[PDB]
A paper describes a structure:
2-Oxoglutarate (2OG) and Fe(II)-dependent oxygenases couple substrate oxidation with 2OG decarboxylation to give succinate and CO2; they have important functions in human biology, e.g., in hypoxia signaling, extracellular matrix biosynthesis, lipid metabolism, and DNA/RNA damage repair. The human 2OG oxygenases studied, factor inhibiting hypoxia-inducible transcription factor HIF-α (FIH) and aspartate/asparagine-β-hydroxylase (AspH), catalyze C3 hydroxylations of Asp/Asn-residues. Like AspH, human factor inhibiting the hypoxia-inducible transcription factor HIF-α (FIH) catalyzes the post-translational oxidation of Asp- and Asn-residues in a 2OG-dependent manner, however, to give the β-threo hydroxylated product. FIH was initially identified as catalyzing hydroxylation of an Asn-residue in the C-terminal transactivation domain of HIF-α isoforms (Asn803 in HIF-1α), a reaction that suppresses HIF-mediated transcription.
High levels of FIH substrate hydroxylation were observed for 3-methyl-2OG and 4-methyl-2OG, both of which are natural products, regardless of the substrate, indicating that these 2OG derivatives can efficiently replace 2OG (entries 2 and 13). NMR studies reveal that FIH converts 1 and 12 into 2-methylsuccinate with a similar efficiency to which it converts 2OG into succinate. Notably, 3-methyl-2OG is an efficient cosubstrate for both FIH and AspH (entry 2), whereas its isomer 4-methyl-2OG is apparently more efficient in maintaining FIH compared with AspH activity (entry 13). The FIH Kmapp-value for 4-methyl-2OG is similar to that of 2OG, indicating a similar affinity; by contrast, the FIH Kmapp-value for 1, the 3-methyl regioisomer of 12, is higher. The observation that the conformations of C3- and C4-alkyl 2OG derivatives are very similar to that of 2OG in complex with FIH is in agreement with their similar Kmapp-values. Although the C3/C4-alkyl 2OG derivatives were used as racemic mixtures, the crystallographic analyses reveal that, at least predominantly, the (S)-enantiomers of the 2OG derivatives bind to FIH, potentially owing to their ability to engage in more efficient hydrophobic interactions with the hydrophobic Leu186 and Leu188 sidechains. The increase in length of the 2OG C3/C4-substituent from methyl via ethyl to propyl appears to correlate with enhanced FIH inhibition. Thus, although the C3/C4 methyl-substituted 2OG derivatives 1 and 12 do not inhibit FIH (entries 2 and 7), 3-propyl-2OG inhibits FIH efficiently (IC50 ~2.7 μM; Table 3, entry 4).
Numbering used by the authors:
A (entry chain A): 20 to 349
B (entry chain B): 3 to 20
Write the structure that this text describes.
């Protein structure tokens, strides 16, 4: 609007080996949007006003008003901020994380951000912090001004469980969260800057090769999107994504179990996002066959969990599964 | 009992627990 030019251009997108097709961008009043959510397919909603009061947020406003709580800030010497569960690192002591978590005050995050910009350093930062009671007064008022009427009615219409968390995300241009899926429904509310989102449906599990359930990187893809090892991950040559770029005011529905790869646009400045994580609807009373892909994903996860428990050691899960299949099911 | 045991979903997300 106002003829301010192209918000972004394709030069700012990283290059990958797979094709994509676009996620629909719709008005929340469009019946097709309702259709996509009800069928757990991704959609970008352009006019929800979900986080309208937060669109004025920048680092200055937040430092002044977000309080003096602790904020988890991840640091990496690479653009890939691969998520890992610190609590599972015991199971895989040969795993050396490439990003480190550091607690700090918000003004320390801005200052550390400022230093890196001055020194031209290569270090990268990504703040990822659940919002909680410790936020300042004006942030509380903004939070209350979110469109709870709209999102509460979505939660009720879809039979979802409780809102578990709102994750505040502040990243540097070029930051990447590698492909993974979450076990909760997500309304991904973009606030500042532009994020390219590439989603893959649950039925491409075979092409994306998640880590073992007991690995710290459970639910994350093993494939290095920047250099896919096609000999270890041959079916990654069959992956096809759903792509969009969200900017301030957009809300992307990331359905539960859907893989997503998220990157802050190159040379786009900092990005700010707040997500809305809801527990999924319960498993229905009557089961309809054939099962959906995501039901099979749930089954596979539980098989891995139970074997790790029964065998008394996650390291024995792999060997037992191979014993099961070799010359029997393959 | 067993079929619903295997179909039961978790709720893990990309947010570190304390
Ligand atoms: C961590 C995040 C993506 C990002 O880096 O914005 C994500 O997967 C999510 O909100 O569920
Ligand atoms: Zn996610």
């Amino acid at each position: 609007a106002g003829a301010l030019g192209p918000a972004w251009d394709e030069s700012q997108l990283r290059s990958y080996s797979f094709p994509t097709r676009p996620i629909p961008r719709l008005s929340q009043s469009d019946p097709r949007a309702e259709e996509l959510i009800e069928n757990e397919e991704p959609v970008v909603l352009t006019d929800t006003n979900l986080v309208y009061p937060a669109l004025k947020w920048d680092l200055e406003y937040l430092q002044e008003n977000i309080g003096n709580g602790d904020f988890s800030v991840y640091s990496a010497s690479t653009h890939k901020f691969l998520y890992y569960d610190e609590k599972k690192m015991a199971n895989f002591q040969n795993f050396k994380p490439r990003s480190n978590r550091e607690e700090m005050k918000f003004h320390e995050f801005v200052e550390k951000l400022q230093d890196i910009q001055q020194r031209g350093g290569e270090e990268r930062l990504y703040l990822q912090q659940t919002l909680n009671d410790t936020v300042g007064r004006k942030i509380v008022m903004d939070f209350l001004g979110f469109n709870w009427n709209w999102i509460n009615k979505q939660q009720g219409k879809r039979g979802w469980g409780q809102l578990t968390s709102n994750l505040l995300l502040i990243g540097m241009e070029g930051n990447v969260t590698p492909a993974h899926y979450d076990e909760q429904q997500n309304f991904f509310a973009q606030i500042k800057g532009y994020k390219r989102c590439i989603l893959f449906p649950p039925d491409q599990f075979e092409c994306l090769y998640p880590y073992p359930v007991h690995h710290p990187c459970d639910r994350q893809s093993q494939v290095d999107f920047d250099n896919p090892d096609y000999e270890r991950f041959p079916n990654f040559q069959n992956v096809v994504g759903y792509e969009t770029v969200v900017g301030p005011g957009d809300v992307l529905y990331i359905p539960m179990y859907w893989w997503h790869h998220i990157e802050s646009l190159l040379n786009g400045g900092i990005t700010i996002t707040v997500n809305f994580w809801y527990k999924g609807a319960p498993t229905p009373k009557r089961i309809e066959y054939p099962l959906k892909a995501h039901q099979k994903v749930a089954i596979m996860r539980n098989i891995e969990k139970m074997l790790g428990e029964a065998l008394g050691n996650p390291q024995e899960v792999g060997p037992l599964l191979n014993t099961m299949i070799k010359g029997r099911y393959n | 009992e067993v079929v619903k045991l295997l179909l039961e979903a978790g709720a893990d997300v990309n947010a570190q627990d304390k």
